[PDB]
Assembly symmetry: D2
Homo-oligomer: 256 residues x 4
Amino acid sequence: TVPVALVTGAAKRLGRSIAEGLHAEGYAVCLHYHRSAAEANALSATLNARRPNSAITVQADLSNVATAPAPVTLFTRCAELVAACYTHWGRCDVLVNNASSFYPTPLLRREAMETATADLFGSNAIAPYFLIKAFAHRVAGTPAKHRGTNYSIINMVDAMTNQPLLGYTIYTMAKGALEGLTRSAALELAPLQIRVNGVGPGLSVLVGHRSKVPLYQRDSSAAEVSDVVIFLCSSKAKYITGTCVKVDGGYSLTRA
Amino acid sequence: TVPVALVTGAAKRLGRSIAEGLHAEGYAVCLHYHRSAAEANALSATLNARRPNSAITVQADLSNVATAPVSGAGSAPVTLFTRCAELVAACYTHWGRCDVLVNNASSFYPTPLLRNDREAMETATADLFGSNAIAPYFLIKAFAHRVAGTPAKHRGTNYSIINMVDAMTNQPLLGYTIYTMAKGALEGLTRSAALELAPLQIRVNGVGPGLSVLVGHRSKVPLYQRDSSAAEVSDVVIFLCSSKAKYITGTCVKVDGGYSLTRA
Amino acid sequence: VPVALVTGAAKRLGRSIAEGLHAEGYAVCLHYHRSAAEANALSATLNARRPNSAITVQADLSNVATAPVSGADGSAPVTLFTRCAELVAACYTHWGRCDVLVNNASSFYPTPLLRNDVGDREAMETATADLFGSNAIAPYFLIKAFAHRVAGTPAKHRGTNYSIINMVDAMTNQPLLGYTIYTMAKGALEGLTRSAALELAPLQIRVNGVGPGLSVLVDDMPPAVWEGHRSKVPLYQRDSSAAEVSDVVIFLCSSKAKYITGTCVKVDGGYSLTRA
Amino acid sequence: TVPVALVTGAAKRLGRSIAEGLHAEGYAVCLHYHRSAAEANALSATLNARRPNSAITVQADLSNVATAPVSGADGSAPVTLFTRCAELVAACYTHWGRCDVLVNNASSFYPTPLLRGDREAMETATADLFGSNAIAPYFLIKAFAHRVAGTPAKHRGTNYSIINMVDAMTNQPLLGYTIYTMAKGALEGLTRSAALELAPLQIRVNGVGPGLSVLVDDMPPAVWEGHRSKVPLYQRDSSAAEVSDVVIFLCSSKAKYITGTCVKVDGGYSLTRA
Ligand SMILES: NC(=O)c1ccc[n+]([C@@H]2O[C@H](COP(=O)([O-])OP(=O)(O)OC[C@H]3O[C@@H](n4cnc5c(N)ncnc54)[C@H](OP(=O)(O)O)[C@@H]3O)[C@@H](O)[C@H]2O)c1
Ligand SMILES: NC(=O)c1ccc[n+]([C@@H]2O[C@H](COP(=O)([O-])OP(=O)(O)OC[C@H]3O[C@@H](n4cnc5c(N)ncnc54)[C@H](OP(=O)(O)O)[C@@H]3O)[C@@H](O)[C@H]2O)c1
Ligand SMILES: NC(=O)c1ccc[n+]([C@@H]2O[C@H](COP(=O)([O-])OP(=O)(O)OC[C@H]3O[C@@H](n4cnc5c(N)ncnc54)[C@H](OP(=O)(O)O)[C@@H]3O)[C@@H](O)[C@H]2O)c1
Ligand SMILES: NC(=O)c1ccc[n+]([C@@H]2O[C@H](COP(=O)([O-])OP(=O)(O)OC[C@H]3O[C@@H](n4cnc5c(N)ncnc54)[C@H](OP(=O)(O)O)[C@@H]3O)[C@@H](O)[C@H]2O)c1
Ligand SMILES: Nc1ccc2nc(N)nc(N)c2c1
Ligand SMILES: Nc1ccc2nc(N)nc(N)c2c1
Ligand SMILES: Nc1ccc2nc(N)nc(N)c2c1
Ligand SMILES: Nc1ccc2nc(N)nc(N)c2c1
Ligand SMILES: Nc1ccc2nc(N)nc(N)c2c1
């Protein structure tokens, strides 16, 4: 049997690491991307080279916008992401909401503020919700007899959002939304044995505040975060749900 | 002169109580509403009867959608940001100031992840996230620009924003995911706005009811075994707005009779 | 006519709380350990403004047995629980009631996990007892005694606004380096706030916390380093005044707050929102 | 080559599972106990049978009281909690020359209501509940840290880890268990404080908080079923392993960027309301 994982924003950095980690545990991986076509396909080739038919790639804008062929809504695109797993492998056991846009929306000093709202809220919060819904329908729609035994959803949150980065309000709001989703989804999907957890990095794979991380005085490596994600997805973590785990080297414990 | 408060969803229940509470402390009140025209105007008449020119009513859909221009009809021109800016502007146009903002307006209804039609998900998403999170952000932006745009010598001395949050969102109501998500966003806004607006001395706080003015659920509340009254919530909002609370910012105050301390 | 007991009431925030409560019409039992002069001076002020509106009681709130006397000798020794029961009693003996309790008294000093990487079993066995006593254990026994006197009053002769306030700390999730026992104690105090709110709800006794960030900071340091510490608070770039904290305590004690219980209110100018 | 773990309250249930779990990853285990001598020595024999010299069992009251020093009617006398704690950690260094992991698992748990010669049960409840759950962990952590600091950087281990067994439900307190709840609150504080202070020594300090685990069935079957079914996930309390596997993961080098955090292992129980 092969378990299947869908990882959004899978092409580089943390998403890559999560994809690789899950693959190393024997998962077939659906690598989602938006712009990073080259890196996603390059990664898929690597995984497929180690293990045939263990990686595909699909493309999607997770921004809260309808596109063009009815233009196509964000819900439709999200449903089609999950479907891509079922079409290709007949299952989807793990979902990782990792894709996330991150840039300033200052309150102090209007078209590019239309699209900021749709992008930052789409990637970080709205799309995750629709992805979860699609994920949950597919599971519910499978007869109990042929359901998987380790359904897990991980939401990439942020360990530092209680201590907001100055000027990043929409982003912080979006992560707040995502934490809400983690709790709400965990509660509603418990009957289907679908676990919903969060993982929140502090500082990871940077390119300043490096020296202010108490443990090691450095940002983390990609693996230092993905290993937590992978652990939470393992059956060892089968009683954990609705919780967020900080992977931040004690950064959230600091003050100015 | 007279301090001015903008209160969204002001027509009934908690928003009305907040409006009344603020008015009782001497504030002029801009009462926002969406469809409760009758109850908003009725309230404005009451306040204006008690004190001339101390209340106006303004109408706005705070959903994350477009509305029509002049003599037209909807999904066209007027954005949520524009409508929000015009709400804050209405205070400055009428009274020349806006000292307090209360983000109270909020849609609340089920969005189940488990079925157990096509626009349903679109308009729920825009409404629940608009009222509860997006509009509050734009309202705060508009609020902040106006304060920033006033020359220092001419600014008020007690700028306060209150966000109606939810004391129970860490223990989510089954099937209310988008709503819970939206309140989560609102909490983030509270913290983020408090930090960014601190230099302008604008305070940003949350108030979170548990159960208030219910139309045994009550019997579950540890203290008194009842939902709260409107005043039991608005008095907290009003206190946080007072100058005695001038060192409080970026915090959420539960007003829940100890409901959040319970478990199944 | 309503009565308040305020521990550590002689100076600073405790003084402000006492004054604030007194200004709302409360009779105030001012508790002190070390500050006799400053407590009696305050009591005289309050009594001058309003006759019989202030008394002073002395007690070490450290988790130690302290024997029959402050001079003579022995019989059986006096536990912390006894001392705490006698504090609450002092209110009932003098005024026949105790409507509000404010656990404000608190010791605060370093207990480093590491040395450099003198000390004894004394400074150690007494730091634990003092920091945990003042901040957590005594509050628990105070609350017990408070709750027993309320429960023991026939429903007809009970007050209508019973309130307990626990002075917590807004910054304990971002611990001050080297202050572990103190932080642990505040952690314990937070727990007490939740647990007591739940258990005392049926008697309509509300239990809430107030947590300062930086308040009435002491300048036993260079002016620039004082300016240094002040300016990291986002709101106003200063520590708070005593009133800025006490007004919150007083509001939570008012009937206007009678649906709030089991919550902690930071009063910190957004300091808890910062990071290194 | 062999990493060493100290586990307090190791004799059964969760502590045993943690001990077994750590032993399965190759740790030598110092099993602590207070009252459960038989169970602790039985477990030690098991571990030692699977791998020689991979388990010892030390005895200690972690209550906040001073004990008497093996006696001899002479020699000052009062052994403080701090001393007993230092001697626990020392026992690892004496026997194996190291101590890489500490698990503060030992915990007394019983009612201290605020309503309704036993001054005796107020003093001793306070010392026991606060000792086991908070004070002793503090001294244990101190001893642990002093001993790492005292090692020349050259010989230090590379995966120092402290786990504190907390409680996922303490924000929603169990009626009548105030001291216990306060004690867990203290423990949470310790986790944060110790993480911050011990970061320079690369000692990680984390919490693991169960909701319901291996629920004692001393009630009507249906009362047990009732409580049981309050957990959203699976409608049951956890198994010991379902908790210890989390402890063991946090101790692994794959978790070496995690510090100062508490991980709920509660099947979503903390998400419920009355
Ligand atoms: N890096 C950190 O220190 C840090 C700190 C806290 C939290 N996190 C969280 O951890 C996760 C991963 O971190 P990261 O730094 O690796 O992320 P990242 O480098 O900033 O980007 C993640 C991916 O998100 C995708 N994405 C962004 N907007 C999208 C949109 N509108 N539609 C579809 N895809 C979109 C991008 O895909 P394409 O390139 O294919 O377009 C991008 O590769 C994120 O959720 C982040 O919020 C990271
Ligand atoms: N009631 C409770 O027990 C409870 C519990 C937790 C939190 N809260 C929070 O406390 C606040 C007030 O509670 P409540 O029960 O008084 O609220 P409510 O009765 O449900 O309604 C508040 C107002 O929000 C306005 N509104 C809703 N959607 C809108 C939209 N899309 N655009 C513009 N206005 C919109 C409505 O105005 P119109 O009628 O004029 O259209 C409504 O009167 C809310 O933020 C709520 O989330 C309440
Ligand atoms: N000041 C701040 O910025 C700050 C920050 C966070 C939290 N807080 C909290 O707010 C409360 C008041 O703050 P503060 O700065 O005004 O307090 P403070 O000046 O440090 O002292 C409070 C009082 O506690 C009493 N006290 C200390 N140990 C005692 C003991 N073992 N037994 C009996 N009484 C004892 C002392 O009374 P005597 O002088 O009579 O001996 C002292 O005057 C405290 O709970 C504190 O933890 C304050
Ligand atoms: N079980 C749960 O559902 C649950 C829920 C939440 C949190 N937890 C936490 O998880 C941990 C383990 O749970 P558990 O149920 O396995 O614990 P447990 O059965 O209640 O006992 C743990 C051990 O602690 C030791 N202990 C108690 N008081 C002591 C003292 N004063 N001095 C020295 N040792 C003492 C006992 O050792 P001896 O028998 O050798 O005397 C006991 O075996 C505890 O920290 C607990 O607080 C458990
Ligand atoms: N430091 C940093 C770099 C990139 C990031 N990307 C996303 N999506 N979110 C972050 N918080 C982030 C942080
Ligand atoms: N019980 C109840 C009734 C009405 C409500 N309205 C809003 N907007 N939000 C609520 N949480 C709510 C709750
Ligand atoms: N029981 C007893 C007998 C004699 C004592 N003498 C002093 N000085 N102090 C005591 N506590 C004492 C007690
Ligand atoms: N800065 C400061 C000064 C005095 C204090 N006293 C107590 N008791 N607690 C504090 N946190 C404190 C802080
Ligand atoms: N249910 C249960 C059983 C035993 C326990 N032991 C300790 N020490 N702590 C608990 N919370 C506990 C809970």
